[PDB]
Amino acid sequence: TFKMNTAQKAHYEKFINALENELKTRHIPAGAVIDMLAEINTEALALDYQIVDKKPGTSIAQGTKAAALRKRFIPKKI
Numbered sequence: 001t002f003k004m005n006t007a008q009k010a011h012y013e014k015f016i017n018a019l020e021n022e023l024k025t026r027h028i029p030a031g032a033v034i035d036m037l038a039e040i041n042t043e044a045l046a047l048d049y050q051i052v053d054k055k056p057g058t059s060i061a062q063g064t065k066a067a068a069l070r071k072r073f074i075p076k077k078i
Helices: 006-022 030-045 066-072
Strands: 049-053 073-077
Touching: 006 030, 006 049, 006 066, 006 073, 030 049, 066 073
Parallel strands: none
Antiparallel strands: 049 073
16 A cells, blocks of 8 residues: 555545454345445545455455455555
């Protein structure tokens, strides 16, 4: 994330942490992940970056931690 500025990184980390928190108590199905990506990327757009799912069209398992999330949901400057 060395290419990203502080605003982009703050937004991205807020997302990763919130996502980890959601996953404490549930699985998130593939269609919900797609909806989530559109929601967060619409916001990230205003900050000139996007989050890319490296495992697109898949669900996310309960208990998945931030370090794992960061390897799957990768931020890229637009």
